[PDB]
Design a binder for this molecule. Structure first.
Ligand SMILES: CC[C@H](O[C@H](C)CO)c1ccc(-c2ccccc2F)cc1NCCO
Ligand SMILES: CC[C@H](O[C@H](C)CO)c1ccc(-c2ccccc2F)cc1NCCO
Lengths: 204, 204
């Protein structure tokens, strides 16, 4: 049918009042299937054994079941990365869907770990699963949270750094959904530029 | 050793670049040996003369040799059934390994005979031979394709309809590997229920 779009209030209502959809034995299907990955760079193990597929889901209710479980069981320590990517896109630059891409980046201060990290990450996840960028949601690959002593980072990765209209729409809506004051500028950088380098390619 | 698991890309690469394994004079052995059966209900012959063992194989390269041959020489007409089952499991409910079982069913409409039947059947076969359900692949008995004017059907048969964790894992991974949109619900039904009866026992 048409793209399955859910707004923030609808998704939030499914957490405590989910499972009452009119089909799918009550589950609300998502537009896309998503995979959650965990990474921690531990030099004692291989890179392969450091990247872990945690879980895949494709309904609102299964997203919340995973969210609730992670909220109870998972490591929030420096050096952890968590990534939510569309099924079939590995959470790495070399994936065919990421090689030409880039990311909208949010950088937090340490004071913002207690005030803002959880709420900004949740808002990011809802933008993803809810297809909040209308047709330009198709350019979204995934999102990454890096937990770091120097300051945590959240990013939305998109497929094509030269798709100006898609990339800028995603950034504007993401900023709006995060609720950031206008004066707090966020930037988009291609993955190629992040490999070796406010002055970003696009700013909103 | 450990379970022999092959992903889709590896299996696909063996079709045109097969026979270069480091042992077995180049063949890649499968975890299981498999038997391909054909059935057509023809009232002029007995039931036993209507069920035919076509061939058995136990390597990736011999799977592709059979695939290529069937693709050239075999009947695709309404009333045909083809079944790929682990060696020693007959493709019938009464087999000891199927009596307590059930199936994940995919039902096609006629527009999907040309767009989807071959690709969905191939993806099913790759899930089977590649042991794509990890430890729960041991609950897989086989798969069946029914060619019908009213709409073709593909199913994965499993051994125990009350093994909830195994059955549900198989269904989720099968749906993921078929690439079905989240909103396209597939259902599991016990063979006992198929004998006399969206509302299925498990849905994913
Ligand atoms: C492990 C805690 C981690 O914390 C972040 C850094 C801030 O929140 C984290 C990771 C992934 C998910 C997640 C869950 C379901 C689907 C997709 C996901 F990415 C949720 C959480 N944390 C929830 C509690 O805040
Ligand atoms: C008409 C041939 C039939 O078509 C199906 C319905 C759709 O594709 C069919 C049956 C069995 C196999 C098969 C081959 C090797 C191992 C196991 C198998 F089940 C392959 C094909 N078709 C290949 C594409 O022509």
């Amino acid at each position: 049918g048409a793209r399955i779009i859910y707004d923030r209030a609808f998704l939030m209502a499914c957490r405590g009042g989910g499972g009452e959809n009119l089909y799918f034995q009550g589950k609300h299907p998502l537009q896309n299937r998503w995979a959650l990955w965990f990474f921690k760079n531990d030099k004692s193990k291989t890179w392969q054994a450091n990247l872990r597929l945690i879980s895949k889901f494709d309904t609102v209710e299964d997203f919340w079941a995973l969210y609730n479980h992670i909220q109870l069981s998972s490591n929030l320590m420096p050096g952890c990365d968590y990534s939510l990517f569309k099924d079939g896109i590995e959470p790495m630059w070399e994936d065919e869907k990421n090689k030409r891409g880039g990311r909208w980046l949010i950088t937090l201060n340490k004071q913002q770990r207690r005030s803002d990290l959880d709420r900004f990450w949740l808002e990011t996840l809802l933008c993803l699963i809810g297809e909040s960028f209308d047709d330009y949601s198709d350019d979204v690959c995934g999102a990454v949270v890096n937990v770091r002593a120097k300051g945590d980072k959240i990013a939305i990765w998109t497929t094509e750094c030269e798709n100006r209209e898609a990339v800028t729409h995603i950034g504007r809506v993401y900023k709006e959904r995060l609720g950031l004051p206008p004066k707090i500028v966020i930037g988009y950088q291609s993955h190629a530029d992040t490999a070796t380098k406010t002055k970003n390619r696009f700013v909103v």
